[PDB]
Amino acid sequence: MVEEFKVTPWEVEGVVDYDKLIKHFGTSPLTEDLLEKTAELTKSELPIFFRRKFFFSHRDYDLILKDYEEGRGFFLYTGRGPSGPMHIGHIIPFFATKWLQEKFGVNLYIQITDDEKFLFKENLTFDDTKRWAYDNILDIIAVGFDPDKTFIFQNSEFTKIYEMAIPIAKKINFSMAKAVFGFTEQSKIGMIFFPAIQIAPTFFERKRCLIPAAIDQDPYWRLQRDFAESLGYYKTAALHSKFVPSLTSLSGKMSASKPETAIYLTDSPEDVEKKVWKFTCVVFKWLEIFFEEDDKKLKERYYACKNGELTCGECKRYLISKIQEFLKEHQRRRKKAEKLVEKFKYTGKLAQEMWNEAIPE
């Protein structure tokens, strides 16, 4: 409908209207019955972010469920751009991907775009982008995925994605690249080629693909669906989440560009405290999105704050408690993840199959 905010795979500016964005991008709203269809098919309760509609939009999700119950299955694909340390917003797609692999028992491909973040950022060198890649793996593997149904790879290392991208790189016209991603005459040739690389993992299997991500990554999936059939694959399915807002603002997105308003997965308990205490509804947004896994306590405390039974200080003390408990658990797992990197990258069942794409010798 209206134009005053920006949502690209690299920028999110201004107050985001998710209802308009659903039409701007042409994505289907994740209906109430589609959520209940998953609950009855997996025979379990949906996680916090699904039932509270943090994931608001979808593409061919009804097709994914139809494929599963008819026994032809599917596979999961999500990714991460290692431009620096990860925050709470970056990890939610992976938690959604964890639950989906858990309940449906499907393969998972995780793309670490260390090539992208070198190409798209001037400050960063290719060397330190590979550094953050490893650091980011640790956080991702700390979520807990099936060691035999998951493949985590870097584009610079598992360079087979280049060969996997060439088909679509011949399909994607350059005029339409500039149109979808806003490339200009001043973009780098590596920048212009990259969309082929991010689309490539959808062709890991002949089965249909599901991509749990935030709405900002959608432009890639539109182009995929434009040429999927002519390349002999299914039009990729997607589940789109909203954005985790920053502390001070509601007119943007939690970004590492503003470290003061972002809680990193690697943040200390003192860092959490200092960031929340220091300023001044955002407080309950985070609890609704990720941190309070109880609906009754969420509902009761919100109205206890809205009407004024709870003081502001006691209210954000409760936020700190929740995000401190999660970070303590995550950082503990990070240390345990260090000795599982080889499994998810090389040694594991899926990882071994994929790496057996090196010429027989």
Per CB under 8 A, residues contacting a second copy are: 115, 118-119, 126, 155-157, 159-163, 165-167, 169-175, 177-178, 183-193, 195-196, 342, 345-347, 355, 358-359, 361
The amino acid at 212: P
Instruction: Give which of a second copy, ligand TYM, none residue 358 binds (C-beta under 5 to 8 Å, depending on kind).
Output: a second copy
Window contacting ligand TYM (CB under 6 A); options: 39-47, 75-83, 180-188, 344-352: 75-83
Query: What region does 98 belong to: left with phi over 0, alpha with psi -120 to 50, or beta?
Result: alpha
- Reported as type and span, the H/E element at residue 101 is helix 88-104
Nearer to a second copy by C-beta: 106 or 161? 161
- Kindly state the smallest distance separating residue 57's Cβ from ligand TYM, in Å: 12
Task: Assess 111 for contact with ligand TYM (CB under 6 A).
Answer: yes
Pair 243, 109: CB distance under 8 Å: no
Phi, psi of 59 (to 5 degrees): -140, 125
Strand arrangement of the beta sheet that strand 209-214 belongs to: 28-29, 55-59, 237-241, 209-214, 75-80, 107-112, 150-154
Task: Name the minimum Å distance from CB 115 to a second copy.
Answer: 5
Helix (H/G/I), strand (E/B), else coil: 26: coil
Residue 14 or 190: the one with the smaller Cβ distance to a second copy is 190
Report the distance separating Cα 92 and Cα 88, nearest Å: 7
Q: Least Å distance between CB 120 and a second copy?
A: 9
Select the residue interacting with ligand TYM from 152, 254, 272, 327 (CB under 6 A): 254
CB of 90 to ligand TYM, least distance (A): 4
Complex with a second copy: residue 114 or 218, whichever CB lies closer: 114
Check residue 195 for interaction with ligand TYM (CB under 6 A): no
Q: Considering CB distances under 5 to 8 angstroms, the limit depending on partner class, which of a second copy, ligand TYM, none binds residue 213?
A: ligand TYM
Stretch that binds ligand TYM, among 38-46, 173-181, 185-193, 241-249 (CB under 6 A): 241-249
Alpha-carbon span 114 to 118, nearest angstrom: 6
The amino acid present at 176, given as its one-letter code, is: M
- Least gap, CB of 119 to a second copy (angstroms): 5
> Counting contacts by CB under 6 A, is residue 152 touching ligand TYM?
no
- Choice between 225 and 310, CB closer to ligand TYM: 225
> Would you count residue 214 as binding ligand TYM (CB under 6 A)?
yes
Residue 87 · residue 216 · CB < 8 Å: no
Element of type H or E holding 163: helix 160-171
Pairing of strands 6-7, 107-112: unpaired
217 binds ligand TYM (CB under 6 A): yes
DSSP bridge pairs for 210: 76, 237
Instruction: Please report, for residues 98, 155, 267, 301, 328, the alpha-carbon distance to residue 325 in angstroms, rounded to integers and kept in the order given.
Output: 19, 34, 12, 19, 5
Binds 241, which of a second copy, ligand TYM, none (CB < 5 to 8 A, cut-off by type)?
Answer: ligand TYM
DSSP tag of 244: P
Among the candidate windows 78-86, 165-173, 175-183, 317-325, which touches ligand TYM by CB under 6 A?
78-86
Q: What is the rounded distance in angstroms from the CA atom of residue 158 to the CA atom of residue 355?
A: 8
Which spans of this chain sit near ligand TYM (rule: CB under 6 A)?
9, 78-81, 89-90, 92-93, 111, 113, 116, 198, 211, 213-214, 216-217, 241, 243-244, 253-254
